[PDB]
């Protein structure tokens, strides 16, 4: 099935009557308007492009404005695409609400993880630090060796080194759908999802199942 685009509101807990605290992420899923429908004849694949939220009229550029106007929908804060199964079918201008997940048990949530910046090997790849004492010289959190001798005489590709960590697309799979609140446009999922508060999330029905 297709997914929806929501916003990470924060984390909370739900107390069940049998004394269990469920940690939940709150995802504000407002109405997603279909701005374009792609098919085999014109695009070679079946998908829908959706938008959500609102945008400044003076910060919508004329190309974006025309693309929205052809669909006849209000300008959202972005455009996302969802592939279509052969049964699913939508029309341009149709709005999709969080009710789509009313009967969905598990979801996959994708978001841009929080950026850590330039991270060292210890943080980024869980390398073990060298000894803090016992004579160690300036080499407490350094990577250590990065290869063998003359053979091969080079460093292999994909070597685990320091560099940019986080701020990338991350998907968490098979999260329970705790609650679907249509009137408040809320999806309460069990557990933690990638990204900071106020980030965009893509919520799809679980592919693993």
Question: For residues 96-125, which are near Mg ion according to CB under 5 A?
Answer: 115
Residue nearest to Mg ion (CB): 115
Give the torsion sign (CA, 73, 50, 63, 75).
Answer: positive
Residues facing residue 179 across a β-bridge = 188
- Burial (CB count <10 Å: 0-12, 13-18, 19+), residue 145: exposed
What values do phi and psi take at 95, rounded to 5?
A: -105, 140
Q: Which does 15 bind (CB under 5 to 8 A by kind): another protein, RNA, Mg ion, none?
A: another protein
Q: Which is nearer to another protein, 10 or 66 (CB)?
A: 10
Least gap, CB of 95 to Mg ion (angstroms): 34
- Asked whether position 88 contacts RNA by CB under 7 A, the answer is no
- Asked whether position 187 contacts RNA by CB under 7 A, the answer is no
CA distances from 204 to 95, 142, 146, 171, 178 (A): 17, 41, 40, 10, 15
Least gap, CB of 63 to Mg ion (angstroms): 27
x/- track of binding to RNA for residues 115-154 (CB under 7 A): xxxxxxxxx-xxxxxxxxxxxxxxxxxxxxxxxxxxxx-x
């Amino acid at each position: 099935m297709i997914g929806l685009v929501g916003k990470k509101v924060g984390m909370t807990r739900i107390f069940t009557e049998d004394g269990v605290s469920i940690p939940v992420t709150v995802i504000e899923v407002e109405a997603n308007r279909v701005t374009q429908v792609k098919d085999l004849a014109n695009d070679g694949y079946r998908a829908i492009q959706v938008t959500t939220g609102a945008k400044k009229a003076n910060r919508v550029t004329k190309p974006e404005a025309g693309h929205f106007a052809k669909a006849g929908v209000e300008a959202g804060r972005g455009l996302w695409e969802f592939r279509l199964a052969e049964g699913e079918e939508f029309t341009v201008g149709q709005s999709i609400s969080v009710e789509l997940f009313a009967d969905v048990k598990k979801v996959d949530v994708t978001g841009t993880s929080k950026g850590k910046g330039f991270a060292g090997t210890v943080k980024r790849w869980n390398f073990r630090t060298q000894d803090a004492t016992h004579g160690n010289s300036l080499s407490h959190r350094v990577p250590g060796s990065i290869g063998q001798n003359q053979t091969p005489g080079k460093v292999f590709k994909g070597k685990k080194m320091a560099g940019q960590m986080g701020n990338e697309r991350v998907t968490v799979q098979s999260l329970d759908v705790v609650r679907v609140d249509a009137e408040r446009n809320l999806l309460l999922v069990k557990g933690a999802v990638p990204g900071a508060t106020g980030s965009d999330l893509i919520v799809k029905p679980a592919v693993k199942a």
